[PDB]
Design an enzyme around this catalytic site. Structure first.
Site, PDB file in Angstrom:
ATOM      1  N   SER A  41       0.736  -1.253   0.000  1.00  0.00           N
ATOM      2  CA  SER A  41       0.000   0.000   0.000  1.00  0.00           C
ATOM      3  C   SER A  41       0.777   1.322   0.000  1.00  0.00           C
ATOM      4  CB  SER A  41      -0.959   0.003   1.196  1.00  0.00           C
ATOM      5  OG  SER A  41      -1.724   1.191   1.237  1.00  0.00           O
ATOM      6  N   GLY A  42       2.087   1.342   0.158  1.00  0.00           N
ATOM      7  CA  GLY A  42       2.666   2.619  -0.227  1.00  0.00           C
ATOM      8  C   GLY A  42       3.578   2.958  -1.405  1.00  0.00           C
ATOM      9  N   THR A  76       2.949   1.837  -5.878  1.00  0.00           N
ATOM     10  CA  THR A  76       2.703   2.866  -6.871  1.00  0.00           C
ATOM     11  C   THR A  76       3.844   2.956  -7.862  1.00  0.00           C
ATOM     12  OG1 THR A  76       1.605   4.034  -5.071  1.00  0.00           O
ATOM     13  CG2 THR A  76       1.907   5.209  -7.153  1.00  0.00           C
ATOM     14  N   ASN A 129      -0.320   2.213   8.785  1.00  0.00           N
ATOM     15  CA  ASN A 129       0.044   2.796   7.491  1.00  0.00           C
ATOM     16  C   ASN A 129      -0.447   4.226   7.355  1.00  0.00           C
ATOM     17  OD1 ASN A 129       1.331   0.556   6.117  1.00  0.00           O
ATOM     18  ND2 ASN A 129      -0.702  -0.334   5.804  1.00  0.00           N
ATOM     19  N   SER A 134      -2.513   5.610   2.469  1.00  0.00           N
ATOM     20  CA  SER A 134      -3.079   4.317   2.136  1.00  0.00           C
ATOM     21  C   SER A 134      -4.526   4.600   1.797  1.00  0.00           C
ATOM     22  CB  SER A 134      -2.950   3.337   3.306  1.00  0.00           C
ATOM     23  OG  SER A 134      -3.547   3.870   4.476  1.00  0.00           O
ATOM     24  N   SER A 135      -5.031   4.002   0.729  1.00  0.00           N
ATOM     25  CA  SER A 135      -6.157   4.641   0.076  1.00  0.00           C
ATOM     26  C   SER A 135      -7.360   3.746  -0.121  1.00  0.00           C
ATOM     27  CB  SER A 135      -5.729   5.160  -1.284  1.00  0.00           C
ATOM     28  OG  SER A 135      -5.040   4.159  -2.009  1.00  0.00           O
ATOM     29  N   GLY A 189      -7.464  -5.322  -0.419  1.00  0.00           N
ATOM     30  CA  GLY A 189      -6.906  -4.753   0.791  1.00  0.00           C
ATOM     31  C   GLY A 189      -7.398  -5.376   2.077  1.00  0.00           C
ATOM     32  N   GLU A 240      -5.879  -5.541   6.149  1.00  0.00           N
ATOM     33  CA  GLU A 240      -4.889  -5.275   7.178  1.00  0.00           C
ATOM     34  C   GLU A 240      -5.485  -5.626   8.531  1.00  0.00           C
ATOM     35  OE1 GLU A 240      -5.937  -2.530   5.130  1.00  0.00           O
ATOM     36  OE2 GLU A 240      -4.606  -3.389   3.611  1.00  0.00           O
TER      37      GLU A 240
END
Ligand SMILES: Nc1ncnc2c1ncn2[C@@H]1O[C@H](COP(=O)(O)OP(=O)(O)O)[C@@H](O)[C@H]1O
Ligand SMILES: Nc1ncnc2c1ncn2[C@@H]1O[C@H](COP(=O)(O)OP(=O)(O)O)[C@@H](O)[C@H]1O
Lengths: 152, 453, 371, 371
Positions: free
Chosen positions: B103-104, B108, B154, B157-158, B380, B382
């Site tokens: 996620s970071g 990307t 995190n 994180s989107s 996703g 977590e």
């Protein structure tokens, strides 16, 4: 005059998490058409650094990243294919047997003989039409045999 | 006792020969101390941000060959694209490639490089205006602020749902792409814990720097005011929102779309946070919830170009009937509070939805599409010690994705049984774990009964 | 698929899927037929007419009214109505949904048995249920305990419901509904002696009942104002034709509810019935009901009922303890709304009748299986 | 770890760790179940209810009362109660502590055997003990000799205890407790003839027993005042509903203890029983008991009992010798308090039952091992 795009039967004021299902659901449906492809991705490290592994979250990520229990699933498969020529190029040793290369023996035949010394099984192995199939343990024991025999 | 050096130098988790997790893990760790990049299970490749210089990109491999099907070449994500192409090229129905967690940064970065390899596909197809990665970058900073969120574990994180599509009227050099609209998490607007913060847009705008907007926004630079906003943690120490504001400007100007609309648009969000102040009151001998007469409502009226009294009467005791028409009155405090939050959230949602129209149109082309290849960012899941339903629901969706993974593999592997003559002794993994979902899902949904009740 | 609910609470008839806020459209359950030789040969003769179609067509049609006293009078007529409603409004096929039925409580089994028999046989429909009004009234009003008053087109009710349970002994059921009141109205109206009696003429009154009625705050005092003033008196048109102007004759009407002398019966009235039925029910609960007091539908539409009701309870209650009543805006729709809620919850999947039972046992199934 | 004590002296039920001053919370041991068809389908049906939860919920529930005459009526119900109490109030697991049990003396073995059997098997609990009320009463009251009167919810007691020993022959045990008195109350109450009989209605009286009772100083003289005055008469509300106002009917009630004619039995009453049981016990000790006289719990709450008791003893005693009684404030809690003390001392580590014995021998162990 934001408002027109602001503005525009299944439910009303309700069904809300199920709406969130619905939103996924359409996506899933459309994906069903496709071939999917797959990548799973990791920070092995404490950080994003040249600095070294941090294990435990990598453990759990891999738990979260299907390969781990996917491989759990697959091991039942004896999910395994190993090619005649290399394999026999190792394995002939115990048969101590000469019958000519080519198809006097198939790999299948050479197996049936070596297995005749070694094993009869489905689960530990079965024949494949060009490549050969095994319980995870089995290759392990195969080469265990190989070192033990060649050392002696 | 463990799979020996023959196994130890192989490419593949996929070709395992001993199953216990540590084997896999240490071995890939051995890749890592070898720095050996590209790791394989399923039929597919598994990825680590190397955190260092390497010219993985450098075209000697990338251009000079398509490469090979899986067994035949060194592991690379470049493969997965490559063979997905030739697969689709003959097959000529669509495929997407699916990329998890992370996620970071590396997530990307590698998505970028994915489109970079799309550019390499363009070069493969033909060769002789933002650059197409750079075109995605046009989206990226604003959208990144737009739906990033902070996890306890995190920090950007989107929790939108985005999906990325790329579209071919061409099998030439490359043809143009979509990024698309998928599960968005409205509840985050509802709630935060004091450790936790809000949809980043809000946090970003609400910093102090732009002197005119704040009052134009009819806003105090204080987050502290807006309790519905306030619910979170009061800052992230060192993510510097003055510059991030400037970046937001940079993008919105790069939109080539009008100041007046876009300002009004984030101003909508301003109204939204103003709604957190709205608070109603319950009279004697009566159940209704009833007004605080409030400059907040007047701000709304101004920004909306409604009048506040119009809100007061027409909403605060509604009308619905058709075939004759009839009026709705007396809502509970909770009814009101929920209701308005819902409206605000839906409006935020809508605003995201609108972003599609023009942003894509900037992307969008009268160059045709016949066929499609796609990208997704997150399955996703977590963990926290502490939990809230929505997150679990997304986790549900994740495992659902895994259903999809499993039953496709189930089918394909059965084809491999066919391949060398062999007969299936195994049943649908998709079904098998779907049963685990089925505990969550009957025609009764677990979620369903909750919200239902 | 999806789930659909008929309201057959009398008056206009209400039907809609689970989760819509309000039914798609609504129909009186008038039925009517020709009265005169059909003399345009060009006309197609249809021999029966229903719904707003009839409401337009009325004049040569004459009405039958297929529900007396909440009891549905003539089955095949109902079947006509029902068929029409599905196909014409709903564009729906009987297979398409479970269907939910809305019943006067404490009334003869026959309505249960034939209704189910017809609708499983004549229509063929995945799942069936029949539900008692008050339950819906609570669900919509969202207070698990209560007592309900809803005096519709049809027979007029008192039920206390406690949270999660029935007190069927507690319950009172009355044929005092607005229709019969309206027919009393004419026996009023001949005092001013603009006078007409037929069914359509009777329904014309319904409009006046919408427009012109309001509740007496105090009867004596109102008479004193009646002697003083004409603001009590208002001027109203024929739906077409004359202006008509009406005195105390407006407010006198609702008092019948408090005093059913004027068409004469003894049951000591809504409020005294209610307190009676309370004093039947046990001692401790009572405060809650003093708090939770709920009213709906046809009669309740009138402005002011709740107030004089409270006046009455303050008469009858020991003043010491809190009293209030609920008067929601939407009461006339309330039932079908509650029905929608009722439809929503998965438990009816446990609970519906299925075709299978109707195969394996008769209408008898219902009376065990449902309330 | 730490040590935990249940009070199952009847009435509300008392539970708490060693060394807390007062139990965490307390529950009636009502048990109750539904009475009516469950007609909110939205409601979850729970078929049994206990404790203040029920005390709220009562009206459609109906009560069972799991202890008659101090004898616990229905084991599985107890088990429900017990489980609830641990988990809901105590947040406690059976392993967590030794547990101490509180018993009517001189009553059938069965309560011992099943209680222990269940609690070692159904719960699994480090150490168990069952103890006789009077012992605790002394420990709390802190006089090693004595005689105790404690007439709780349940069967009513006389035990002389001398310092460090029992006189089990001496002991008297009576089913005269306040519940049965209360049920007599109704047969009083119909004189004024506001009248209601059911279990919850009966518990409503308990409040009046709190508020409205006081002890007759002299019966004849009280009747004379009854003829004279209405200050004897006080005005009280329904818990909701009416004001109610009560005459001699208040004070007449406790006299039953002195004269159990009114619900008619012969045992010559508390005081005469006591002096009888004394005259059984031997001659020299007596003065101490004349000094040390101790009372507790449910009935004793009433103002004035000790005084007329002393009047009675001055009747029966040779006046020559000192007499007094103890009337502590806290009597109703006294038992569990004493239990806490009982828990404190290490000697029960010598004394507890352990699981091992229950393994190696039956419930029979208790009756040797405990009193
Ligand atoms: N605007 C109005 N004002 C007062 N009463 C009305 C109005 N419209 C309809 N009614 C009355 O309300 C009733 C409508 O039927 P309804 O209340 O649904 O009966 P049911 O309880 O049997 O369903 C009829 O008695 C009708 O005359
Ligand atoms: N405020 C009060 N005044 C008088 N009696 C009371 C009061 N509260 C409870 N009681 C009575 O005291 C008894 C409470 O039970 P308890 O004394 O603990 O019995 P046990 O001795 O069996 O434990 C019951 O008889 C109850 O009715």
């Amino acid at each position: 005059k934001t408002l027109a795009f602001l503005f525009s039967k299944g439910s009303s004021f309700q069904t809300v998490s199920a709406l969130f299902r619905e939103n996924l659901n359409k996506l899933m449906t459309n994906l069903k058409s496709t071939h999917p492809h797959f990548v799973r991705c990791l920070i092995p490290n404490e950080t994003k650094t040249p600095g070294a592994m941090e294990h435990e979250l990598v453990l759990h990520q891999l738990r979260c990243n299907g390969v781990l229990e996917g491989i759990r699933i697959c091991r039942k498969g004896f999910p395994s294919r190993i090619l005649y020529a290399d394999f026999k190029q190792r394995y002939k040793v115990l048969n101590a047997s000469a019958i000519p290369e080519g198809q006097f023996i198939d790999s299948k035949k050479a197996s049936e003989k070596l297995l005749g010394s070694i094993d009869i099984d489905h689960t530990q192995y079965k024949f494949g039409h060009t490549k050969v199939f095994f319980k995870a343990g089995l290759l392990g024991t195969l080469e265990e045999m190989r070192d033990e025999k060649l050392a002696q | 006792s463990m799979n020996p050096p023959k196994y130890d130098k192989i490419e593949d988790m996929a070709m395992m020969t001993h199953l216990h997790e540590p084997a896999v893990l240490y071995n890939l760790k051995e890749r890592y101390a070898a720095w050996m990049i590209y790791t394989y299970s399923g039929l597919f490749c598994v990825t680590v941000n190397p955190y260092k210089w390497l010219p993985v990109y450098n075209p000697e491999v990338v251009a000079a060959y398509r490469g090979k099907k899986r067994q035949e070449a060194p592991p690379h994500i470049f493969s997965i694209s490559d063979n997905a192409y030739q697969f689709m090229l003959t097959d000529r129905e669509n495929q997407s490639i699916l990329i998890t967690g992370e996620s970071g940064a590396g997530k990307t970065v590698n998505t970028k490089r994915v489109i970079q390899y799309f550019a390499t596909i363009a070069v493969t197809g033909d060769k002789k205006q933002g650059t197409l990665e750079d075109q995605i970058i046009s989206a990226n900073p604003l959208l990144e602020a737009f739906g990033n969120a902070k996890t306890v574990r995190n920090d950007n994180s989107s929790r939108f749902g985005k999906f990325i599509r790329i579209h071919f009227g061409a099998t030439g050099k490359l043809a143009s792409a979509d990024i698309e609209t998928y599960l968005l998490e409205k509840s985050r607007v509802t709630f935060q814990l004091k450790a936790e913060r809000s949809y980043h847009i809000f946090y970003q705008i609400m910093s102090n720097k732009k002197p005119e907007l704040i009052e134009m926004l009819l806003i105090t630079t204080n987050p502290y005011d807006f309790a519905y906003v306030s619910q979170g943690e009061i800052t992230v120490p060192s993510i510097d929102d003055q510059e991030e504001l400037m970046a937001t400007d940079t993008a919105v100007d790069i939109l080539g779309f009008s100041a007046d609309e876009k300002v009004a648009i984030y101003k909508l969000t301003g109204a939204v946070m103003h709604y957190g102040n709205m608070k109603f009151k319950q009279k004697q001998r009566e159940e209704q919830a009833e007004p605080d007469g409030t400059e907040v409502a007047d701000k709304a009226a101004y920004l909306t170009s409604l009048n506040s009294a119009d809100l007061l009467k027409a909403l605060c005791y509604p009308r619905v009937k058709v075939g004759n028409e009839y009026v709705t009155k007396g809502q509970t405090v909770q009814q009101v509070y929920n209701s308005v939050g819902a409206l605000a959230k839906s409006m935020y949602e809508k605003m995201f939805l609108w972003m599609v129209t023009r942003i894509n149109q900037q992307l969008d082309t009268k160059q045709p599409r016949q066929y499609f290849i796609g990208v997704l960012d997150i399955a996703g899941f977590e963990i926290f010690d502490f939990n809230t339903l929505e997150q679990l629901c997304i986790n549900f969706t994740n495992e659902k994705l895994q259903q999809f993974f499993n039953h496709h593999m189930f089918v394909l592997e059965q084809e491999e049984y066919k391949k060398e003559g062999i007969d299936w002794e195994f049943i649908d993994f998709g079904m098998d774990l779907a049963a685990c979902i089925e505990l969550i899902e009957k025609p009764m949904g677990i979620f369903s009964i909750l919200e239902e009740e | 698929t999806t789930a659909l609910v008929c309201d057959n609470g009398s008056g206009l008839v209400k039907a809609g899927f689970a989760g819509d806020d309000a039914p798609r459209a609504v129909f009186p359950s008038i039925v009517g037929r020709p009265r005169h030789q059909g003399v345009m040969v060009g006309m197609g003769q249809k021999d029966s007419y229903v719904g707003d179609e009839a409401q337009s067509k009325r004049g040569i049609l004459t009405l039958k009214y297929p529900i007396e006293h909440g009891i549905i009078t003539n089955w095949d007529d109902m079947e006509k109505i029902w068929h029409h409603t599905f196909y014409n409004e709903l564009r729906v096929a009987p297979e398409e949904h479970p269907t939910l039925l809305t019943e006067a409580p404490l009334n003869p089994k026959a309505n249960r048995e034939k209704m189910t028999q017809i609708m499983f046989e004549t229509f063929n429909v995945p799942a069936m249920y029949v539900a008692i009004q008050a339950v819906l009234s609570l669900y919509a009003s969202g207070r698990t305990t209560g007592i309900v008053l809803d005096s519709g087109d049809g027979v007029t009710h008192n039920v206390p419901i406690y949270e999660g349970y029935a007190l069927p002994h507690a319950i009172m059921r009355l044929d005092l509904a607005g229709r019969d009141l309206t027919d009393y109205l004419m026996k009023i109206l001949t005092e001013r002696g603009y006078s007409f009696v037929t069914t359509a003429e009777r329904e014309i009154v319904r409009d006046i009942k919408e427009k012109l009625c309001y509740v007496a705050l105090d009867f004596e005092n109102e008479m004193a104002t009646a002697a003083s003033s004409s603001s009590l008196e208002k001027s109203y048109e024929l739906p077409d034709g004359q202006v008509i102007t009406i005195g105390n004759e407006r407010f006198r009407c609702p008092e019948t509810l408090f005093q059913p002398s004027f068409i004469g019966m003894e049951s000591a009235g809504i409020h005294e019935t209610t307190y009676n039925s309370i004093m039947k029910c046990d001692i401790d609960i009572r405060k809650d009901l003093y708090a939770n007091n709920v009213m709906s539908g046809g009669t309740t539409m009138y402005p002011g009922i709740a107030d004089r009701m409270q006046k009455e309870i303050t008469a009858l209650a020991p003043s010491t303890m809190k009293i209030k009543i609920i008067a929601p805006p939407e009461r006339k729709y309330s039932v079908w709304i509650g029905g929608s809620i009722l439809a929503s919850l998965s438990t009816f999947q446990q609970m519906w009748i299925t075709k299978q039972e109707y195969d394996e046992a008769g209408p008898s199934i219902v009376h065990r299986k449902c309330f």
